[PDB]
Design an enzyme around this catalytic site. Sequence first.
Site, mmCIF file in Angstrom:
data_model
loop_
_atom_site.group_PDB
_atom_site.id
_atom_site.type_symbol
_atom_site.label_atom_id
_atom_site.label_comp_id
_atom_site.label_asym_id
_atom_site.label_seq_id
_atom_site.Cartn_x
_atom_site.Cartn_y
_atom_site.Cartn_z
ATOM 1 N N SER A 62 0.903 -1.273 -0.019
ATOM 2 C CA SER A 62 0.144 0.095 0.062
ATOM 3 C C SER A 62 0.892 1.364 -0.249
ATOM 4 C CB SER A 62 -0.835 0.167 1.196
ATOM 5 O OG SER A 62 -2.216 -0.620 0.848
ATOM 6 N N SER B 8 -5.684 2.848 4.309
ATOM 7 C CA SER B 8 -4.978 1.829 3.316
ATOM 8 C C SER B 8 -6.142 1.061 2.643
ATOM 9 C CB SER B 8 -4.336 1.107 3.939
ATOM 10 O OG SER B 8 -2.999 0.511 3.144
ATOM 11 N N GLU C 196 -5.464 -3.845 -6.527
ATOM 12 C CA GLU C 196 -5.681 -4.392 -5.384
ATOM 13 C C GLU C 196 -6.557 -5.493 -5.593
ATOM 14 O OE1 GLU C 196 -4.478 -3.983 -2.558
ATOM 15 O OE2 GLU C 196 -3.531 -2.166 -2.345
ATOM 16 N N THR D 126 1.903 3.391 5.305
ATOM 17 C CA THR D 126 2.496 2.027 5.582
ATOM 18 C C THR D 126 2.193 1.198 4.246
ATOM 19 O OG1 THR D 126 0.301 1.380 6.253
ATOM 20 C CG2 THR D 126 2.133 2.264 7.832
ATOM 21 N N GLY D 127 2.784 -0.077 4.152
ATOM 22 C CA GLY D 127 2.430 -0.941 3.369
ATOM 23 C C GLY D 127 2.768 -2.325 3.868
ATOM 24 N N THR D 128 1.825 -3.266 3.928
ATOM 25 C CA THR D 128 1.940 -4.609 4.266
ATOM 26 C C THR D 128 1.313 -5.702 3.567
ATOM 27 O OG1 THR D 128 1.284 -3.707 6.437
ATOM 28 C CG2 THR D 128 1.316 -6.088 6.391
HETATM 29 C C1 LIG Z 1 -3.633 -8.744 -0.842
HETATM 30 O O1 LIG Z 1 -3.012 -7.633 0.230
HETATM 31 N N1 LIG Z 1 -2.606 -8.108 1.304
HETATM 32 C C2 LIG Z 1 -2.746 -7.730 2.271
HETATM 33 C C3 LIG Z 1 -3.356 -6.376 2.424
HETATM 34 O O2 LIG Z 1 -4.515 -6.285 2.418
HETATM 35 N N2 LIG Z 1 -2.549 -5.441 2.073
HETATM 36 C C4 LIG Z 1 -2.736 -3.758 2.429
HETATM 37 C C5 LIG Z 1 -1.691 -3.045 2.876
HETATM 38 O O3 LIG Z 1 -0.649 -2.622 2.222
HETATM 39 N N3 LIG Z 1 -2.248 -2.701 3.879
HETATM 40 C C6 LIG Z 1 -2.120 -2.085 4.972
HETATM 41 C C7 LIG Z 1 -0.932 -1.131 5.186
HETATM 42 O O4 LIG Z 1 -1.116 -0.046 4.630
HETATM 43 O O5 LIG Z 1 0.186 -1.430 5.510
HETATM 44 C C8 LIG Z 1 -2.656 -2.632 6.160
HETATM 45 C C9 LIG Z 1 -1.629 -2.814 7.576
HETATM 46 S S1 LIG Z 1 -2.715 -1.879 8.699
HETATM 47 C C10 LIG Z 1 -2.720 -2.678 10.088
HETATM 48 N N4 LIG Z 1 -3.740 -3.453 10.691
HETATM 49 C C11 LIG Z 1 -3.700 -4.514 11.847
HETATM 50 O O6 LIG Z 1 -4.696 -5.083 12.120
HETATM 51 C C12 LIG Z 1 -2.575 -4.104 12.516
HETATM 52 O O7 LIG Z 1 -2.489 -4.833 13.661
HETATM 53 N N5 LIG Z 1 -1.728 -3.375 12.345
HETATM 54 N N6 LIG Z 1 -1.673 -2.624 10.992
HETATM 55 C C13 LIG Z 1 -0.512 -1.867 10.963
HETATM 56 C C14 LIG Z 1 -3.874 -3.069 6.128
HETATM 57 S S2 LIG Z 1 -4.069 -4.647 4.905
HETATM 58 C C15 LIG Z 1 -3.488 -3.218 3.699
HETATM 59 C C16 LIG Z 1 -2.033 -8.060 3.701
HETATM 60 C C17 LIG Z 1 -1.829 -7.616 4.808
HETATM 61 S S3 LIG Z 1 -1.205 -8.620 5.839
HETATM 62 C C18 LIG Z 1 -1.002 -9.704 4.715
HETATM 63 N N7 LIG Z 1 -0.228 -11.049 4.941
HETATM 64 N N8 LIG Z 1 -1.406 -9.517 3.391
#
Ligand SMILES: CO/N=C(\C(=O)N[C@@H]1C(=O)N2C(C(=O)O)=C(CSc3nc(=O)c(=O)[nH]n3C)CS[C@H]12)c1csc(N)n1
Lengths: 265, 265, 265, 265
Positions: free
Chosen positions: B42, B100, B140, B209-211
């Site tokens: 993200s 996000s 996405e 952020t990105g996750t």
């Molecule tokens: C197909 O996508 N896969 C995802 C996903 O949805 N990615 C998106 C992305 O970059 N996102 C971000 C963000 O902005 O960082 C986030 C991180 S926000 C967050 N949520 C919590 O519950 C928590 O405890 N801590 N934090 C920081 C949400 S997912 C979305 C994913 C997330 S964890 C995982 N194994 N896959």
Amino acid sequence: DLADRFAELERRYDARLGVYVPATGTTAAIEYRADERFAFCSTFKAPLVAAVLHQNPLTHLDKLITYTSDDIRSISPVAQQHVQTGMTIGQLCDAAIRYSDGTAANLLLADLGGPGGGTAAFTGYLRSLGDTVSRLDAEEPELNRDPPGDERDTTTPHAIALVLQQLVLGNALPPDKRALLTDWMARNTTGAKRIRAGFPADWKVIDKTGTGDYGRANDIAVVWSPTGVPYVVAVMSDRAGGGYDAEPREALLAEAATCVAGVLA
Amino acid sequence: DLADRFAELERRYDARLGVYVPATGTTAAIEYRADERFAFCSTFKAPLVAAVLHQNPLTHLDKLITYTSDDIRSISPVAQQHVQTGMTIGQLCDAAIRYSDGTAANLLLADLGGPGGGTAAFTGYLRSLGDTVSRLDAEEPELNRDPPGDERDTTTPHAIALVLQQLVLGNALPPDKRALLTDWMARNTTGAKRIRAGFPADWKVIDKTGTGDYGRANDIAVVWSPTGVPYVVAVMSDRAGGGYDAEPREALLAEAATCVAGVLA
Amino acid sequence: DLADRFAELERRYDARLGVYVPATGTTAAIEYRADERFAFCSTFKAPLVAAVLHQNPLTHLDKLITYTSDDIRSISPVAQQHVQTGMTIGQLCDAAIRYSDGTAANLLLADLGGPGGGTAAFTGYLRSLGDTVSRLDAEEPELNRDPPGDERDTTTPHAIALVLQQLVLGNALPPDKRALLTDWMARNTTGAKRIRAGFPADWKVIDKTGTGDYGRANDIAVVWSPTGVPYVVAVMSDRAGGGYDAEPREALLAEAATCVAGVLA
Amino acid sequence: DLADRFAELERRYDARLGVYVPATGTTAAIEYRADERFAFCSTFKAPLVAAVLHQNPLTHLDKLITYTSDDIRSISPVAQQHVQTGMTIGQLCDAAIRYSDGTAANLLLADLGGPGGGTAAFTGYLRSLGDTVSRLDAEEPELNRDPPGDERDTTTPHAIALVLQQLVLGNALPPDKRALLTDWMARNTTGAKRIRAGFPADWKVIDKTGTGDYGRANDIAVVWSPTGVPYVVAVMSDRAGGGYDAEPREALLAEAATCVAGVLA
Ligand SMILES: CO/N=C(\C(=O)N[C@@H]1C(=O)N2C(C(=O)O)=C(CSc3nc(=O)c(=O)[nH]n3C)CS[C@H]12)c1csc(N)n1
Ligand SMILES: CO/N=C(\C(=O)N[C@@H]1C(=O)N2C(C(=O)O)=C(CSc3nc(=O)c(=O)[nH]n3C)CS[C@H]12)c1csc(N)n1
Ligand SMILES: CO/N=C(\C(=O)N[C@@H]1C(=O)N2C(C(=O)O)=C(CSc3nc(=O)c(=O)[nH]n3C)CS[C@H]12)c1csc(N)n1
Ligand SMILES: CO/N=C(\C(=O)N[C@@H]1C(=O)N2C(C(=O)O)=C(CSc3nc(=O)c(=O)[nH]n3C)CS[C@H]12)c1csc(N)n1
């Protein structure tokens, strides 16, 4: 290359900076002018309280000390409020650490007794901890005013860091009293802009500040990483080039602390 | 020696860590795997909003976008509650950055128009900013799931840091639109445990952020020292050797940030 | 009234509002149209997961359900991401509750089995809880579309509040399963602007939202006072006077909750 | 029915509670012992800063005030660190409000000038605002210690709420100066557990606390609804029957605030 950054800070604030963090199993010691002498200022009030706890059966904390307005010397935010009532030893300990109360420290020194108003016994307490370098010679407020180079009322970042390590993390005190000293430093009200401002919020910081003339500003701290790893940080500074009236620079201690946090992270 | 501390963090967390802080007048660049590729996840939503702001008059922010339940194909905390109400472009920008929101990002990509549902137009915008490295190839949620070593949907700490520098501190956007982007990132809800957790509280941090899978955890931030001096900090990581389901380690990014804070202090 | 303030909210938002808070030892019940029928919308997904948990050993949670994109109807942010992999019952429970996933709810209904795609057995599960009023008749998304006055797919604030009281605070489920349901509702992502927005932050809120046509917006919650005293709060609303596309007003529910908080303080 | 709810809070916390919320166009006044006297404690520091702002140009905030260790006679979290540096009027205003600094308020009273070290001129400023009830007779720290029933250093919820309404929402101050007062209260560090804890997170709250002996706990606030509708909330309490050392109960103020929020929702 940490010494370059500390010497950089010295240049920025026209200051002499002393930094010591004792080695752990995982981390090497950090030493910047660690063995040069700096004035205690109020940082002696933390080991002073340990001296009182060490030689007294705790019920001594309830002993009420009375004093007069003539005894009020130096910054004493709590003692000025209790000339009429007196203060228990416990309240003097609480005040001396959390509010850096100068009168409370003098009354606690007097409670140690002996020549120089308790300062020989306080030095002697440091010797019991293995600190042969430090010395207290005067009371509040004179102990802040010794000229640069004068060895009286000085410690070193090395010596006081090791003292605090034994008091908070080691076995200088039984767990009973250790917890009281730790909680007072944990609830200190004077350190927000020093070591505490330099570490991320999720590190725990307990500290005791010190401030005096010649731009003296100290902070001695025990900090815990977010994983619960403790480190002792002594940061001491003065600005003697500016004379007696040189102003303390709290931001120096915050920045020095941030530098330390980066090595320990 | 900063690189040695980064390698220790990589070991501690079984992670690959990328760090870039652009040089300033007083400070040298900080580079660790600055030119290696890491997945956007993200973090692309910050420049995406800038791309939408860049090619549209401010009034475009009030255009109401309607969408269907079929468009909710990813984590969309805000757009999911607004299928029946629609959402304004401004609210999609707000949602893409502060929450996000995955659906918000796809609608903003489509608003950019062109091949691949906006993915070509977004890359071209990064190219127009001088970013010769980065590429967005999917929408996405697929863009988070490219296998390690796949170049699609990747950037580098170096490239994204320079993009972000132009958007927030440079003149990529006029001041009105730049202020909107900065405010959205300033009020982000997802970064509390990353670059923000590693910097002292008196540093200001805005971030995106990105996750993703493979333990991917990124954080791109603009931080201001207590003296008000700005730095751009890009921290990217993955745990790709640990497979698709490897958990991200937010604490890795917080610790990398604390290392960076110590050098910038 | 309290009834004057709820009826003022009905005026403000041109809505029909149903509120039920079961009596406790300390507080009298709160009732506003508590026994009128309102559409379930997604609020049935919370008792549905309880129905699934009650009928099956925990090991059933690991059973893999496969489905096709043809099965994906209604807002299904998680099921849209797993057509190719399938999903276990557990993640279907997770998705149905935390993301209000409509496909996850249809599959969980199917796992209950029997006529009407599981809706007779889900209704039968409510009867086992003492709820003789409520009924589920259709699947997602049809269960959101019944015209006003139609008794199908309806519950009452009274009936569902007592259903939820038994599932979260009572003994309908063994403590093992009760904890899984409670944890899913505690980590729900769809309720931030409903009952959660109306209660002070130091009140703990777990909830399950519901949204449909005719301006239908529900939220069922268990809330805990700062001292740890639980209350069940059912708030249901619709705006049928405005027709099929009447927009839900989430803000009605936050305000109704704030009114409820004021009497519980 | 609200008065009944306040009387219960009074019973629960062994406290006397005063509540005043001025009438608006849409809402009736809320009054519970609105005209009984309660001790100011540090709540006087908000109109104190208003007085300093009112009778001086903005540039007066840059004036450097120096003081001595003898001036530190009360809890002064900021001023006890600046005996050697001095503090500007601006920094004293910030400190008196955000940290409730006792020395800062005494120094600001001296800046008001006149008999009683500024207490006559500050009261005279309250009179100019139409407050015929309130009076300040002592400085820090004495003004917190008057016995119950003593009229000195007292106000009423009615009077202080009307003063605060004029300061923040009315025209007692020009907008430049109004914004400084509002901003300091918005960033207050002492009120998290009082009116702010009792209102939902999406209500904006700015406040100034007061705390003293006899279980005195006050909080005066301006709150904005999620709609941006402002209300003034004065909540004052003491537990004077419990003696000098009776503990203040912050939760009483939060619960009282939750009751008011429920009526204003
Ligand atoms: C197909 O996508 N896969 C995802 C996903 O949805 N990615 C998106 C992305 O970059 N996102 C971000 C963000 O902005 O960082 C986030 C991180 S926000 C967050 N949520 C919590 O519950 C928590 O405890 N801590 N934090 C920081 C949400 S997912 C979305 C994913 C997330 S964890 C995982 N194994 N896959
Ligand atoms: C950790 O420091 N932070 C502070 C700060 O300075 N707080 C102080 C602290 O620890 N305080 C304490 C006490 O000693 O218990 C108190 C109590 S002061 C007091 N207590 C009594 O029981 C009594 O009989 N008389 N008096 C005067 C309140 S804040 C001050 C602060 C001020 S505003 C803010 N947000 N933080
Ligand atoms: C309380 O709700 N608040 C939310 C919110 O919606 N958070 C969600 C929540 O609980 N989330 C979860 C998850 O399911 O664990 C996740 C993980 S989603 C995910 N995990 C995997 O392991 C994987 O393989 N794939 N994917 C897609 C992150 S945020 C979203 C939020 C949005 S921004 C912010 N600060 N909070
Ligand atoms: C002789 O004066 N006695 C005082 C006194 O100085 N009162 C002042 C007053 O109104 N103050 C306020 C504030 O602004 O509310 C406060 C309350 S703020 C606070 N206190 C804590 O103990 C704590 O842990 N956190 N925080 C944020 C500090 S005392 C000062 C006192 C304080 S407690 C007590 N029993 N007496």
